[PDB]
Design a protein around this ligand. Structure first.
Ligand code: ATP
Ligand code: ATP
Ligand code: MG
Ligand code: MG
Ligand code: ZN
Ligand code: ZN
Lengths: 643, 651, 140
């Protein structure tokens, strides 16, 4: 229907004279600069934002979104033609593929014969000599689609979907152009690969071996060939977009090139790409017809909404965030912003913020002490333990939420599972691995299987998982902080029994928890009325009642916490005696009493990492005495409910 | 070259085209930036005059001022018969940075040039030396790739160094190198070498001119050895959420059978990408390739580990200066305490646990009871750490795990019985069922650290009985019947019943392990918490000081020397001391709820005394060794604090 | 992805007693380009180069090659043509096509596709008898 020479001129015109004031208001050619950067081989990926294209040619954006594979090819053609005139120096040949490109180009010039018309097969395939790769960023005027509803009517179209990443293969080399050499001639043979399989060539087709009518067997080699970083992921529907009685649907996303190594399993992502078929020929197909599988050829992969990425590299922000972080009540404001719909539990929220920020990991002369804070909320029924855990799951960047026994066994640990790219046995992690450097919220901790409690022992202290079962012999790597929620021994605290007889945790597991918080709800008229007013306001308006400080948005909380995270403070010597005295005093009162939990050196280490976290929240580089004071006070408030 | 055969190198792959291209319209290889002449001359310049100006130790030949480090190595290759030169890539990096960049980038073109250069230099001198083949260079110690998941398709066919633990090694695979043919008619024979990975069958005999009468005769052909190795990588960079990685290695001709399962090794080789067929019976290949390493070099040395068995058995591991220094250390009155204190330096005053672990690292005297009908005697020392939590048992187990070669770490319910002994899987590269060893066999000459020993069901803890008694693992499974070797030391850590020591219960009631299993351990260290304020203060200072601010190499070499040369034997007065000690300890342990002594504790004492004599580099077990064995055995179990009626109190 | 197939591509043969037919064809091309007739006094002309030019530009697409010219310029090529005319005339005609291409280049539009050149060939040798066509002359 349409003429692609004119479309190529259109996309050339867009690339050459589109400008924006992004550089601090200075008017830059957004894509000409990148053509410069990738003509000098300083850049590989060119993300063509289609919002930019739509500013001056919405019909082009419609055509792109309707074919989306013709236009990716057109854009690659156009940029490849524009690169020579944007090259202002000579590339340093940073790579080994670059040497092959340079030798091929130089040989082609050397035997040029510019006026002689060479065969269509006597040329280098375009894909063999590109070194860049071009991707679309979907127009924002396209509303994201739901994985279930991306069907045959959108094959070939550019669509945007979002879901949880459930499974990512390892990055492995996918052949793009298979290069062969001959045993007779000295020409190279190229076989661009489009299918998932290919039959390697046997005889060479070069001009010399045809003239000579020689054998000319050709040999497949990796050295001149083109591979691309390839990776296959499975992405899954979000829970709040599944039909009522249904399970979430998956989609295969084929990720190649510079989009690899972005998504990890557990990530919430938005993927823009072309919905494309794979011919699926070969089977003993029941039905006649050209049936095919489907996949999303990823163009843009964006983590989001709990695993947001770009803010991390954008730590520089407004003067405001400077002024709130500088404020003295910043710690109180961040603590209050944790689940504002839950009323009360101010100190619990302070401790939870400490778990999110965490302490500093020590590595002294090969004896690792982990800076993770593990917290257990040992509480009465209906005191909002699960709500706090679910909130912390929605907040923390790498967080997995686990209730009683749905995620038991290999749902926490790893399992060996078959792959598809290589058909061998890959290792897949469970909740403790999917939360490797984040939080794992274990709800109903007390009703957990004993094997899983043992695994949690070894995770909490050594921060690994040792498996020596039949198919698996590995030490997984689980650097997570455990946020546990449990009920006392008989579902409710019994003041007639002893504290550890209510906790029903062994001393070893009880010591694994830096802060173990008792939450009792004794009735009382004033506090019950206040709690009821808060709850009824939340029901009435879907928001917490207004207070003096507006709670921070969960994006701001993530950014503030992440900005705190890279702030390793050191305990000074001037605090050594103060900390030691606090620990000794705490230790003495532990056995002076008859209603105290197990206390050990881990209690000191808990003081020390809690105070390090508190110092970190103030963005200081040394721990002060107020941090140690706040750590001590939180440690007493953990059991304050007993009084 | 002296007419000496130049054997092919399967580790470099099949030869390529090797096209020479002139960059002027100087003579580089096509697709590379190397010309063979300048590379050869650069490497000759390197071999002739390279001196390490910073390294002086563990040479044992290296004059290390004498202008060649490497032509000293050539002299060794003249003295011994082995035609291999191991070149440290860091040396090339120092000498010629561009040559190093060329080597790791085009090893298949640069290493054969290095081979020619080395043989030219070697046969310049030593011109009457005889070698079964010309010298093959083996570059090692390239820039370590910390995580092999970080490797890109840009890295295919380059030289990389990685580290990990050998998990499985295949049987030796014969690879054809030169085919032999006879005519079915005239019996004329011919030979055809591999050319780019295939053999061109003669198809007409040159004698009787019969078409297609030459037949390949497999057992007159020439073959090379190949071996597949599963190596579990040990990345230094472990990004969040990344599971452990198994990499395929292929060893050839001489690196075959050079590593055993459970060995920790640095492997240098070529990163290869290979096509996968869609079925074994078709020639279509997938678009997505799989990767392996073609092994060039195995490096067993690790700075942070102890010497492995292959190293310790090597005769020239120590210079005379080193041996004299070690012996001078052995003459120190408190070498025992110094070596013990060098262990886990970050752990505060567990001096007796550290002495026991030192004795475990030294071990008792290997004995050949074969002519006595007795069986095999366990020379290994098995330590159990039982104590209430937070007392740093897992830190000690982690330290021993991270220090020994051939170690394994197991915790709690994560291991099974067949996962510790052995099981059958199906190798997904051959589609064949192969037998895989478990944790207890991978530590066959090392220490298996079992953590949360108590939180570990009796099914898998029965497997430990035969390992701890007879150092063997007899498996009678469906088809496979054998006796795997499991000569492991066991370092176990366990909690008491109720997870905290309670003083109202006796020692036996409180450890709560089967009483036959406790006799297998030759030290039970009771890591109990005294409710002591002074210790609280001292430990608190150690731990806080840990938040702001004896060598290892000497310890490593001391232990290696003791394992190599010292074989303590019981003296007569040591014999008598042991008799008396056993009788006394049996009187003592026959009390109410104490860990009793069986004839097995006499052998425990013998092992501890032999290990202690070995710490002294003694070669003769004397009364002092037995005295320290008794003392260590009593201090563990706190038998001074134990009354013959009840439990213990405090020290 | 399993639907299309691009072609097979190849490059020029960069790099690298009985000469291969490519080399013989190259020597035929050299003979056609560089066989010079005349003397410096009367000037030199390249007989077959300008004969190809003239014939092609007229639309003829053939040339007449004298076997003595070939024998003088390259005696081995002439021996090949006499012993094995079938394959070496294919080489010579392919050479003529190339030379005509590079002497008529560029051509007016409509004449874009290059034509096959028939190489008729003549000699000054005396003809042999039709009775002498025995079996030893087959394929010569
Ligand atoms: N302090 C509170 N503020 C606001 N809402 C609360 C509070 N306590 C309980 N709720 C409400 O009560 C409901 C039950 O809370 P939740 O399920 O978190 O209890 P729980 O602590 O998990 O109890 P269990 O120990 O039985 O699991 C939630 O919907 C929550 O909104
Ligand atoms: N004597 C000590 N020296 C050094 N560090 C100690 C000592 N006691 C306790 N610690 C510190 O306290 C923590 C104790 O945890 P560790 O896992 O080592 O104890 P454990 O005995 O394994 O506990 P459990 O019996 O619960 O498994 C470690 O971080 C350790 O560094
Ligand atoms: Mg709940
Ligand atoms: Mg432990
Ligand atoms: Zn060819
Ligand atoms: Zn024959």
């Amino acid at each position: 229907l349409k003429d692609y020479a004119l479309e190529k001129e259109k996309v050339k015109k867009f690339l050459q004279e589109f400008y924006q004031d992004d550089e601090l208001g200075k008017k830059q050619f957004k894509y000409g600069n990148q053509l410069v950067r990738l003509a000098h081989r300083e850049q590989v990926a060119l993300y063509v934002d289609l919002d930019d294209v739509a500013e001056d040619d919405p019909e082009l954006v419609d055509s792109i979104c309707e074919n989306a594979r013709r236009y990716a090819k057109l854009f690659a053609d156009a940029v490849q033609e524009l690169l020579p005139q944007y090259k202002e120096r000579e590339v340093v040949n940073k790579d080994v593929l670059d040497v092959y490109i340079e030798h091929r180009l130089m040989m082609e010039q050397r035997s040029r014969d510019p006026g002689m018309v060479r065969s269509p097969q006597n040329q280098y395939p375009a894909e063999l000599m590109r070194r860049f790769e071009l991707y679309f960023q979907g127009p924002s005027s396209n509303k994201p689609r739901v994985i279930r509803e991306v069907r045959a009517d959108s094959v070939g179209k550019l669509v945007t979907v979002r879901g949880i990443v459930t499974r990512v293969s390892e990055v492995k080399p996918k052949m793009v152009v298979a290069t062969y050499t001959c045993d007779q001639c000295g020409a190279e043979t190229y076989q661009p690969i489009q299918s998932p399989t290919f039959m390697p060539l046997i005889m060479c087709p070069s001009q010399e071996c045809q003239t000579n009518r020689s054998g000319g067997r050709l040999y497949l080699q990796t050295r001149g060939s083109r591979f691309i970083k390839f990776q296959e992921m499975k992405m899954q529907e979000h829970s709040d977009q599944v039909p009522v009685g249904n399970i979430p649907r998956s989609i295969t996303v084929l990720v190649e090139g510079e989009n690899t190594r972005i998504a990890q399993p557990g990530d919430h992502v938005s993927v823009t790409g072309i919905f494309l078929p794979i011919l699926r020929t070969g089977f003993r197909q029941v039905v006649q017809g050209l049936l095919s599988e489907t996949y999303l050829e990823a163009h843009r992969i964006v983590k989001m909404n709990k695993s947001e990425d770009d803010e991390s590299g954008a730590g520089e922000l407004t003067r405001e965030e400077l002024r709130q972080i500088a404020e003295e009540d910043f710690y109180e404001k961040l603590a209050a912003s944790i689940a504002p719909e839950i009323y009360g539990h101010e100190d619990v929220k302070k401790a939870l913020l400490l778990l999110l920020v965490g302490g500093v990991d020590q590595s002294p002369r090969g004896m690792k002490i982990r800076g993770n804070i593990n917290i257990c909320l040992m509480g009465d029924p209906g005191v909002a333990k699960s709500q706090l855990l679910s909130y912390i799951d929605r907040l923390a960047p790498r967080s997995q939420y686990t209730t009683g026994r749905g995620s038991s066994g290999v749902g926490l640990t790893a399992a060996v599972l078959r792959d598809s790219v290589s058909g061998e046995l890959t290792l897949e992690g469970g909740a403790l691995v999917l939360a490797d450097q984040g939080v794992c919220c274990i709800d109903e901790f007390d009703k957990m299987a004993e094997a899983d409690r043992t695994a949690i022992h070894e995770v909490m202290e050594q921060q690994t998982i040792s498996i020596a079962k039949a198919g698996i012999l590995t030490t997984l790597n689980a650097r997570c902080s455990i946020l546990a929620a449990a009920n006392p021994a008989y579902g409710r605290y019994n003041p007639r029994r002893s504290l550890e007889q209510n906790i029903q945790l062994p001393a070893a597991l009880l010591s694994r928890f830096d802060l173990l918080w008792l939450i009792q709800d004794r009735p009382d008229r004033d506090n019950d009325l206040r709690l009821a007013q808060h709850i009824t306001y939340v029901h009435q308006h879907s928001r917490q009642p207004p207070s003096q400080f507006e709670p921070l948005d969960m994006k701001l909380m993530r950014r503030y916490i992440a900005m705190c995270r890279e702030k390793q403070p050191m305990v000074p010597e001037s605090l050594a005696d103060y900390i030691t005295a606090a620990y000794v005093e705490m230790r003495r009162e532990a056995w002076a009493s008859k209603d105290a939990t197990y206390t050990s050196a881990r209690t000191l280490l808990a003081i020390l990492r809690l105070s390090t976290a508190l110092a970190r929240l103030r963005m200081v580089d040394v721990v002060e005495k107020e941090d140690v004071n706040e750590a001590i006070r939180l440690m007493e408030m953990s059991k304050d409910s007993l009084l | 070259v002296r007419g000496t055969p130049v054997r092919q190198r399967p580790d470099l792959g099949s030869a390529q085209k090797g096209l020479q291209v002139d960059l002027q319209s100087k003579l580089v290889i096509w697709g590379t930036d190397v010309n063979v002449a300048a590379c050869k001359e650069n490497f000759q310049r390197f071999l002739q005059r390279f001196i390490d100006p910073l390294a002086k130790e563990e040479e044992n030949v290296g004059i290390d001022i004498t202008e060649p480090l490497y032509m000293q190595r050539l002299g060794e290759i003249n003295v011994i018969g082995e035609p291999f030169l191991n070149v440290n890539c860091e040396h090339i990096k120092s000498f010629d940075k561009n040559l190093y960049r060329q080597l790791i980038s085009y090893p298949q073109e640069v290493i054969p040039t290095f081979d020619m250069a080395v043989n030219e230099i070697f046969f310049d001198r030593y011109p009457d030396s005889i070698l079964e083949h010309q010298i093959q260079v083996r570059p090692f110690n390239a820039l370590k790739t910390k995580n092999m998941r970080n490797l890109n398709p840009e890295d295919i066919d380059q030289l990389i160094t990685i580290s990990g633990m050998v998990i499985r090694t295949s049987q030796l695979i014969p690879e054809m190198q030169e085919a032999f043919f006879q005519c079915q008619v005239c019996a004329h024979t011919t030979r055809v070498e591999m050319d780019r990975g295939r053999i061109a069958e003669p198809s007409v005999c040159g004698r009787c001119h019969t078409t297609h009468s030459m037949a390949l005769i497999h057992n007159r052909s020439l073959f090379s050895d190949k071996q597949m190795i599963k190596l579990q990588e040990s990345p230094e960079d472990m990004p969040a959420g990344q599971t452990p990685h198994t990499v395929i290695l292929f060893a050839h001709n001489d690196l075959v059978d050079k590593v055993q399962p459970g060995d920790r090794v640095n492997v240098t080789g070529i990163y290869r990408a290979v096509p996968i067929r869609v079925n074994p019976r078709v020639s279509n290949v997938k678009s997505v390739y799989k990767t392996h390493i073609d092994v060039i070099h195995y490096r067993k040395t690790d700075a942070k580990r102890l010497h492995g068995l292959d190293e310790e058995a090597e005769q020239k591991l120590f210079s005379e200066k080193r041996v004299e220094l070690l012996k001078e250390l052995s003459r120190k009155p408190d070498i025992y305490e110094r070596l013990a204190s060098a262990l886990a330096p970050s752990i505060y005053e567990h001096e007796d646990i550290k002495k026991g672990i030192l004795l475990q690292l030294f071990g008792g005297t290997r004995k050949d009871f074969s002519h006595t009908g007795r069986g095999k005697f366990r020379a290994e020392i098995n330590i159990l750490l039982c104590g209430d939590p937070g007392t740093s048992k897992s830190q000690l187990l982690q330290y021993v795990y991270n220090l020994v070669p051939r170690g394994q770490y197991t915790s709690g319910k994560g291991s099974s019985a067949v996962g510790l002994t052995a099981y059958v899987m199906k190798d997904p590269e051959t589609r064949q069922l192969v037998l895989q060893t478990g944790a207890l066999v991978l530590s066959d000459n090392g220490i298996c650290c079992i953590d949360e020993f108590d939180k570990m069901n009796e099914s898998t803890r029965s497997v430990l009985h035969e390992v701890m008694e007879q150092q063997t693992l007899s498996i009678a499974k469906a088809g496979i019947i054998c006796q795997l070797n499991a000569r492991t030391s066991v370092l176990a850590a366990a909690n008491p019943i109720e997870s905290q020591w309670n003083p109202k219960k006796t020692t036996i009631e409180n450890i709560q392990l089967p009483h036959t299993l406790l006799s297998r351990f030759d030290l039970i260290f009771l890591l109990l918490d005294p409710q002591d304020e002074a210790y609280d203060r001292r430990l608190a200072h150690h731990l806080v000081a840990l938040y702001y601010q004896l060598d290892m190499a000497v310890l490593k070499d001391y232990i290696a020397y003791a394992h190599s040369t010292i074989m303590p034997r019981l003296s007569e007065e040591a014999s008598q001391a042991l008799i008396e000690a056993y009788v006394d300890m049996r009187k003592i342990g026959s009390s109410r709820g104490m860990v009793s002594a069986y004839p097995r504790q006499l052998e425990s004492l013998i092992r501890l005394a032999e290990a202690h004599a070995k710490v002294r580099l003694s070669n003769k077990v004397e009364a002092i060794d037995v005295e320290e064995a008794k003392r260590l055995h009593r201090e563990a179990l706190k038998q001074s604090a134990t009354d013959p009626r009840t439990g213990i109190v405090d020290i | 992805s399993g639907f299309d197939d691009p072609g097979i591509f190849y490059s020029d043969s960069f790099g690298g007693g009985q000469a291969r037919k490519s080399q013989l064809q190259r020597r035929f091309k050299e003979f056609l380009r560089q066989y010079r007739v005349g003397t410096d006094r009367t000037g030199f002309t390249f007989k077959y180069r300008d004969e190809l030019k003239r014939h092609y530009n007229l639309g003829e697409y053939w040339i007449e090659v004298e076997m003595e010219d070939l024998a003088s310029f390259d005696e081995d090529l002439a021996d090949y043509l006499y012993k094995q005319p079938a394959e070496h005339l294919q080489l010579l005609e392919e050479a003529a096509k190339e030379v005509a291409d590079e002497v008529t280049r560029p051509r007016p539009s409509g004449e874009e596709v290059l034509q096959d050149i028939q190489v008729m060939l003549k000699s000054d040798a005396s003809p042999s008898s039709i009775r002498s066509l025995k079996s030893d002359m087959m394929s010569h």
